[PDB]
Design a protein around this nucleic acid. Structure first.
Ligand code: ZN
Ligand code: ZN
Lengths: 237, 62, 89
RNA sequence: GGGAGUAGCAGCAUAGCCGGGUGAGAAUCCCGGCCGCCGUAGGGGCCAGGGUUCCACGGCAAUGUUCGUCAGCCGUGGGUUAGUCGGUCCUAACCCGACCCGUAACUCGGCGUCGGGGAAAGGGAAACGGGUUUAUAUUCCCGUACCGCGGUGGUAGGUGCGGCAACGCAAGCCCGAGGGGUGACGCCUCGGGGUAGGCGGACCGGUCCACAAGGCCGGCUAAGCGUAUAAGCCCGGGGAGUGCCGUAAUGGCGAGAACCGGGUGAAAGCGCGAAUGGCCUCCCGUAAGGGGGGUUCCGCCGAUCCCUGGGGCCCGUGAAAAGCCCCUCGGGAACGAUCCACCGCGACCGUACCGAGAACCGACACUGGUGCCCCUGGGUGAGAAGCCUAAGGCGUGUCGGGGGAAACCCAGCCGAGGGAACUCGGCAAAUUGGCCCCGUAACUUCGGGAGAAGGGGUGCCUGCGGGUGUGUAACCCGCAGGUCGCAGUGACUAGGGGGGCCCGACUGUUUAGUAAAAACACAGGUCCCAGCUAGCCCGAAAGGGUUUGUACUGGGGCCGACGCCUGCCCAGUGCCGGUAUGUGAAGCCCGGGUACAACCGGGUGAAGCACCGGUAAACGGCGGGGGUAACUAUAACCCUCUUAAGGUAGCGAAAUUCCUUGUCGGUUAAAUGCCGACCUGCAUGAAUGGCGUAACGAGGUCCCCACUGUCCCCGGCUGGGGCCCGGCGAAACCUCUGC
RNA sequence: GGCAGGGUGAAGUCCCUCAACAGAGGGAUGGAGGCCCGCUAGGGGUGCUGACGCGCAAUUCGCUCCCGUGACCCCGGGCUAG
RNA sequence: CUAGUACCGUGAGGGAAAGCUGAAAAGCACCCCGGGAGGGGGGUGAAAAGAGCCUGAAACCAGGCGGCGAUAGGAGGGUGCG
RNA sequence: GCCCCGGCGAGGCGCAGGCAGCCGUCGAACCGGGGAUGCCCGAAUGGGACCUCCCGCGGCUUGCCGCACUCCCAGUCGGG
């Protein structure tokens, strides 16, 4: 047979690769081996649009001189001072370890293991809520609804991510979707498999119908996982 | 269509230029290697047992 | 017209000659004016030009004599006052 | 060899004639004149590509669709001159090597880092005018300039000042380190100031006309150096709201308006450069050459060229680095420039010509393609439209001659009376057409439909008035009267319209070369996996894509704007989960057997199979014979006969209906058509979506108005071929033959 | 690197008269759109089932027809290989 | 034999044709015609064998000679008599 | 095609039947042996190659030698 789009993406060609030379650099906090117990102070000097991020970024200058990018919280002002460390107050924009953050607080940009730079709750308008503290684990509610435990020495920042409500307004036109997809080299426009030929898709054929259940096993081989992969249920409710 | 008119698009840059090591016009200028001798890719010479061209150059039987 | 001059970074101009030719002259564009580091407002007393034009000027015809010539005067006064008030104790 | 001295040398730009000359020889080569073609390209400039095709002299065996004294052909000799133009520097996307890892190995696959490369239209030091050659010139010559490096000699300064301030100044040298700026940026729209170019009047010098006036030609000024305002930003004074100031527009003000003054700041203009330099012209024997003259003023339009400021849109944010200017620090010396004058040096490569209906690719001196890549005077006019025309180019989109030019064909013009009777089908042709005024249906997502439809008017001359403006400068807007014609958007330019039905929401895309569509895509709806060392994917591995990413995210399917809605079934196939009670391979254990094994019989034994359940915007499915009412009928309903369940709302002879031209009604003189209804739906039906739907369509289909040579019924004209004449000169085909 | 010329008139910003419990009516500014007309240049290929069909051409020509500020057209440098 | 050469293809790659005067150049001195290539007379040589060169077949073409040749019917031949 | 040593013994100047000339008896041509010169690219190696061409370091005096990667012996020199 012939190949699927999901199999051609793995090769790593220009048709599928992200254009990250266009973006502002990655976003990471500060390494522990240089913020051990110091509680660094910085000033916000710019707020910027980032094409690969979905959230606005801010440029912070620290005392030594080092400049860095952070993910911006709703409300942060140009000319405002932020604090990074263990003896930092509880104020929107400051980064502390989870063991020092009360219950009921709204939190973003949480590390998975301490020192990893930030992994969780990064998108526009997202927030996490601190649920429980113990001496071995801190339980947090993630935006998917799921409860997860972290090490109490993992770092998080206080507040909500900026850029929410993005999907309140319709895209309306195909051309606007063209530009939105081109910005991150997403595959657009998308084809249907039932109007492909049989050489091209497990659906496919001149009568344009799936002729077998669209639920497919978790153990099926590649080239065959299309439709509803390992579905617990299907339908309306 | 696919015939006479697209043949007009032949004033671009050439795929192959003259090769510095072997004297043939087989040096691929975007990739940086020769399609005949391997210059730019191999310290050794390209030579295959299914090919006749080196034998012809040396007046050899196949 | 050569391809290098079909490029719209050359600001073409038409000029009539002592022999009656009416030829085209090509020049490069002028860079914009210096801006303040804090506010991004334009600066005064700083001339515009390309490097060759600026190298045919002396030092004192390139910037104002007062201190911090890279700042607008308001921001300069801010800086001097803050220095003063921190030089009290 | 026959075909054959035949076809072709027409069609998209129909071009030659007269006189003179050369020469063995002239439709086809040269000079002059007349007549013509292109004229937002057939003209001008120049990439890639080609490579001597460039120039002069000499030639005509071959090439040139004819001829040839001609040539992009043949021969003989020549021709490309740079400190300032481009390449040699910087980085972009990207590529390579070493180390390292993988591979049985490699000229194979990877890889963070280190280094190296990567743009003749991106960034990026410095030159303009005129002449000279057969052929080169921002490259040679003349004139007048600039850059970098290196010297010499003086000075500013080190060790100095004017301004409340914004700021104004020659305002010290060497080496190193930081910081700021510039480089350095998208799409759309608007104002202000300038320039090239064009137009009108006066004067001079010339030229074309029975005269006549009048028409036409020329009337110039580079780089560089020096010189300042506009917007905008800013500094001082001043002290405001039943508000005042301003813009094309948005706007501004106790977080300091008006108003007085000032500072910095572009493109330009002006002066020098600079003149018997360039152009025009007037006299003499004309070889050298000779000689004398003019080179002036106002006014209008002005860009798609240059500068400068405002406003708007983004689920979209529109490069980087070298280089260059400034400031502050640290370390050194006692000197000494970013100012003035002078002096010397400035390596390598490219530089001819075409740049296309004959110098490139297509086998060709090919109506194709590459390149329309950059640029273009006057009139009418909204106009880079079409038509005429200047400059510049051509008469070589390389065979000609005869002809009141036979039939017949290609491309065009007209046609009495009828007006689609033609034909599968109004195919094709005709009709309408610009601007101003009036007036404008259903339906509608209230935005549209809509230029709906439909009606009136339009030229020339003579006079009056308006707007802006200083203007009998220039542009634009109205009125009245007289007058000619079959006709006044008089040529060119320049919509035919309306009403029903089916599909698809729309703009968009598609089978290069028989299908442009009802097929694809689309916004939007809804389902699935996944908390990241994830989910999905490439690969032999090493490693890798999504990922400079983290659930308002990434991946996987189905339907397909909008409005009203989306019924029942988990028995089957599939997916998910749960209990183990069974079964369950190797291995382990027990026993026998074998002086040891092979072997034989039992137990345990995971995933999976089985068993219990959940799931249909998962694949898919959604039952007949029977009887009955106040008489002929049909049966709400009642007996009923089985499954997981037994087709709900809707639509329905349908792009789905076999009998089929179903039946009834409307449309016609006449209807196997179209529309509307009926329902025994062979074989409709709800996200393999159902029913509707304004706007949209080179989609399919029926009707009405107008119009016409489509037809009754065919006729006459115009150019080009066909035919005769002179020249060049093939092919397909061919057993022999041929009532 | 590029796209003659013309039309329509979205938001935003207002003015006047009469009134003010509510409102009614008349004038402008401004310049949006996968808007409209358009052989501008360019791009495409609906019909005549036209010419040609040992062609000018191994897919061209002419008349007619479609798009023409955008999901548009083109150029130099690179990447994906049976 | 001036052959892995000319030549074709973006490229891997594909790939021809083409031998001989005479013992000796003794390779046609001289005249007429022709714009010329050439023709005709003359010469060298045992012989033109003349570089368009040893021999020089067939198919095909032109002229000369002979027989037939415009009332005529069969695959082009066979037998017999003129 | 330049030099030398031996041989051969008068002509020679490539395939290649020309016009002008030159070399050779002081021993050529030719044959055997041995030397010198030997542009650019190429393993290609001082550093770079979209055109077999470009761009540098030193040190000695224009003229000269050296300057790649991987490894052995070493050792702050060098020899392989
Ligand atoms: Zn090679
Ligand atoms: Zn400032």
């Amino acid at each position: 047979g012939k190949s699927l789009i999901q199999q051609r993406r793995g090769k790593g060609t220009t048709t599928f690769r992200a254009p990250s030379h266009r973006y502002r650099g990655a976003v990471r906090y500060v390494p522990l081996n240089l913020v051990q117990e110091r509680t660094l102070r910085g000033v916000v000097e710019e707020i910027l649009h980032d094409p690969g991020r979905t959230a606005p970024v801010a440029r912070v200058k620290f005392e030594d001189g080092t400049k860095k990018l952070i993910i911006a919280p709703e409300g942060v002002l140009v000319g405002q001072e932020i604090y990074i460390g263990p003896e930092a107050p509880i104020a929107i924009g400051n980064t502390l370890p989870l063991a020092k953050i009360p219950e009921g607080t709204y939190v973003y940009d949480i590390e998975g293991v301490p020192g990893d730079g930030g992994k969780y709750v990064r998108a526009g308008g997202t927030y996490a809520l601190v649920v429980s503290r113990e001496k071995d684990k801190v339980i947090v509610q993630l935006p998917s609804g799921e409860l997860k435990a972290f090490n109490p020495m993992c770092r998080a920042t206080i507040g909500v991510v900026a850029g929410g409500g993005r999907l309140e307004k319709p895209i309306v036109k195909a051309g606007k979707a063209y530009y939105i997809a081109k910005a991150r080299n997403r595959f657009w426009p998308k084809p249907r498999g039932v109007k492909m030929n049989a050489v091209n898709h497990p659906h496919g054929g001149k009568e344009h119908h799936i002729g077998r259940p669209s639920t497919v096993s978790r153990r099926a081989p590649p080239g065959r996982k299309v439709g509803h992969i390992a579905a617990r249920r299907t339908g309306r409710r | 269509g696919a015939g006479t008119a697209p043949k007009g698009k032949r004033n671009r840059t050439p795929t192959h230029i003259r090769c510095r090591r072997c004297g043939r016009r087989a040096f691929n200028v975007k990739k940086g290697y020769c399609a005949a001798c391997g210059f730019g890719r191999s310290r050794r010479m390209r030579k295959y047992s299914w090919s006749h061209k080196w034998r012809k150059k040396r007046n050899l039987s196949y | 017209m050569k391809p290098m001059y079909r490029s719209r970074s050359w600001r073409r101009k038409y000029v009539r000659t002592p022999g009656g030719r009416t030829v085209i002259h090509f020049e490069r564009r002028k860079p914009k004016v210096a801006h303040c580091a804090m506010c991004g407002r334009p600066l005064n007393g700083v001339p515009r030009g390309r490097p060759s034009e600026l190298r045919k000027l002396p030092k004192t015809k390139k910037r104002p004599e007062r201190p911090y010539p890279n700042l607008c005067p308001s921001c300069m006064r801010k800086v001097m006052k803050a220095q003063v008030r921190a030089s009290i104790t």
